[PDB]
Design a protein around this ligand. Sequence first.
Ligand SMILES: *[C@@H]1O[C@H](CO)[C@@H](O[C@@H]2O[C@H](CO)[C@@H](O)[C@H](O)[C@H]2NC(C)=O)[C@H](O)[C@H]1NC(C)=O
Ligand SMILES: N=C(N)c1ccc2cc(O)ccc2c1
Lengths: 241, 105
Amino acid sequence: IVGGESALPGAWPWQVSLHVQNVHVCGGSIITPEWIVTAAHCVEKPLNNPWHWTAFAGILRQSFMFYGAGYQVEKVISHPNYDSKTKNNDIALMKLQKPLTFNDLVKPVCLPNPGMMLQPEQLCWISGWGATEEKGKTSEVLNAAKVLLIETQRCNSRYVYDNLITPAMICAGFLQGNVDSCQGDSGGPLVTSKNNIWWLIGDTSWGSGCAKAYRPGVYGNVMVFTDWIYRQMRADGEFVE
Amino acid sequence: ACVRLYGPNFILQVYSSQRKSWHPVCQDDWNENYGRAACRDMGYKNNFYSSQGIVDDSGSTSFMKLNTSAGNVDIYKKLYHSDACSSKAVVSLRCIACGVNLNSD
Ligand SMILES: *[C@@H]1O[C@H](CO)[C@@H](O[C@@H]2O[C@H](CO)[C@@H](O)[C@H](O)[C@H]2NC(C)=O)[C@H](O)[C@H]1NC(C)=O
Ligand SMILES: N=C(N)c1ccc2cc(O)ccc2c1
């Protein structure tokens, strides 16, 4: 997170830190006791297999996230239409082998329904342990920042992302830059509050540098994938459909 | 053969293969068991948070209503097109307690 401030405990209870080899690689968002929404690009080969991954919920500091304090991942499902070249359909689910116990610091975010009717520049929040400057190192503490949706037509401008923003993507940030997500934030939440509920609007996917002008954040458009998420959650442990 | 929650008030909708569209379901004869079945169909396993009737705000003229005499068929097959809900309410269903932080009051 560039241009944010450190999060208080329980502010973003859905936020997890996904570790491989005892180090943060990416973020994720809790949606049920077993299911986490992350980015497909985080679990590309050679990190496609679940045994690599542990999730840390309810902990703001990376140094407190040590082997044993965390949650072994049991499955990793990349969206079937994920394209690493374009980053299209950059979303994945991780299933934990052990369910999380929800409390004041660990809770789920709501999947986005159709018909949310968000404003075109809806006020959202991003959170994560990614770099606080471009090409920087993982942050020790969880950060968060307000960002605004940026209409996809505006974002596809030849002065911005030159028609690279697909219906499976949404833009957020500031065209003037300065506040953005960054490497390490990937897979983590873009949320908005509406009807007094916090909704998962996006998963951090990509961008060109971090906090540069005319180069805002691109997020997985989660609402496009809610039904796929339902099916995956249902297919899990199911004999016939 | 599918179910979803619509909008910020989580209106249960069911898709019609014929009408090629989504319709809310009447609160008529609905209960928590029907909601739990809907939640399981959305992959939420044993999760259920709440279900209640709410007045439709979408001006809808096409609903899905429970045929209470359908017998022991799946809930999809119990539901028929109706242009009105006798309860004057549609189903609002949340399968999990979500979307609240320590502030959220
Ligand atoms: C609700 O279900 C019942 C029974 O499944 C329906 O009644 C049947 O209707 C068919 C066609 O008219 C008859 O052949 C059967 O003998 C009826 N059986 C009964 C009365 O149990 C009933 O019409 C359904 N209601 C609606 C509005 O769909
Ligand atoms: N500008 C962004 N929001 C943004 C988002 C995700 C990124 C992932 C990376 O690996 C490197 C840079 C990134 C930049």
